[PDB]
């Protein structure tokens, strides 16, 4: 038993809710919240900009030190950093950005990072400003992640389309 509430169950291990991931994290304080990161951990907009704003820019300060030490992530890769006031940990995962021409096949590799964590609160990778089809992203999530994932979808219209079209 965990503290996630109001989710629709899609599969044995994947759950979905129309929710603002920032507000959901603030309430649940999950062990892991996933950020929709880029390779530079520049949290300017989308989910990343919203998560970072909710930490009063502490996420960005920590991220800049991480990059200065380690260099950029790979597309499809991840790193674990602090969850600040939102979660114990933040798993920064880089899905491919279609608006940069990155290979959508890397979306599966991105979701594989979730399997290193037993339970996660997450957005749909490569959705939103990353330019991928969220229905495809949901399919890859379900077919790749084996651990327990609670997906927060900000847009109500999109949430209803994802549910209604789910196979
Ligand atoms: O940035 C994108 O492209 C996204 F479409 C946005 N997303 C979100 N997913 C859940 N909660 C959210 N709260 C937010 C508050 C402000 C801005 C965005 C979000 C958001 C998902 C997304 C990250 C990859 C697709």
Curated annotation (Swiss-Prot):
Reactions catalysed: Thiol-dependent hydrolysis of ester, thioester, amide, peptide and isopeptide bonds formed by the C-terminal Gly of ubiquitin (a 76-residue protein attached to proteins as an intracellular targeting signal)
Activity regulation, short description: Inhibited in vitro by GRL-0617.
Subunit structure: May form homohexamers. Interacts with N protein.
UniProt name for this protein: Papain-like protease nsp3
Domain of life from the UniProt record: Viruses
Domain Macro, chain residue ranges per copy: 1-167
Function (record text): Responsible for the cleavages located at the N-terminus of the replicase polyprotein. Participates together with nsp4 in the assembly of virally-induced cytoplasmic double-membrane vesicles necessary for viral replication. Antagonizes innate immune induction of type I interferon by blocking the phosphorylation, dimerization and subsequent nuclear translocation of host IRF3. Also prevents host NF-kappa-B signaling. In addition, PL-PRO possesses a deubiquitinating/deISGylating activity and processes both 'Lys-48'- and 'Lys-63'-linked polyubiquitin chains from cellular substrates.
Subcellular localization(s) per the UniProt record: Host endoplasmic reticulum membrane
Resulting phenotype, residue 164 to L: In strain: Gamma/P.1
Membrane topology per record: Multi-pass membrane protein
Range of the intact protein held here: 1025 to 1191 of 7096
